[PDB]
Design a protein around this nucleic acid. Structure first.
Lengths: 127, 130
RNA sequence: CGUGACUCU
RNA sequence: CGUGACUCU
């Protein structure tokens, strides 16, 4: 019988996946086990971003990063952390630097989005 | 004014509301100029999505309503002018149910894209502005 | 629906 | 319940 994921912040989504009532029950990085579990649930879902104003760009998740936003880097040739880049480009100080990022789009484009700036898009079937 | 959004609904139903019909069957002939001008004023600038392509629910934004009904409106088909109704029967296997109603013109005008009303839905979430 | 774009990460 | 676009017409 068809059911659709509730449209909601990805932070709340990972709480429900990992069985916290609040995200504060996780004030450290995910274990590998928790990452794998989360990845299995969110991979293939669309999310939309929240940090660029009314430009709510939509992406599909292809992976969850193995590093917290505070340590995950991408070739910016130099390297920048995601948490830093979101400081240096969008002037947002990540509230959850220790949680990983969603990788979206084509893998080669190394687009990482903090869980913080993503909402689950409405209307997608939960199987 | 306070934000409101148009109901997502088939454009045929939308046009019955604009023209105060309860049923489109009340309009068995082409629109008059005045009926067309009233309709146009309401749908112009709204996004629609089409229904004649399976799950490819392609969206376009309305820029005008054609003067001629789909049975008589034409565009350059690769070159020869072809009626909209004829093209839809040939390409889409769709014999129009309301060939006597006009088309929405959509997108950039130069592309001469005309859509029969019956293949269009008003897209949800569009502001209705006083 | 899907995807590309809004110089992104 | 941002804009634009293709798979048109």
């Amino acid at each position: 019988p068809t059911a659709f994921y509730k449209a909601q912040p990805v932070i709340e989504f990972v709480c429900e996946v990992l069985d916290f009532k609040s995200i504060e029950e996780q004030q450290k990085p995910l274990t590998d086990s928790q990452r794998v579990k989360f990845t299995k649930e969110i991979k293939g879902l669309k999310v939309e971003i929240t940090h660029c104003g009314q430009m709510k760009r939509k992406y599909r998740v292809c992976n969850v990063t193995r590093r917290p936003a505070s340590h995950q880097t991408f070739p910016l040739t130099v390297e920048c952390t995601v948490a830093q880049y979101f400081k240096d480009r969008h002037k947002l100080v990540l509230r959850y630097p220790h949680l990983p990022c969603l990788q979206v789009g084509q893998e080669q484009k190394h687009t990482y989005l903090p869980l913080e700036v993503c909402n689950i898009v409405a209307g997608q079937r939960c199987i």
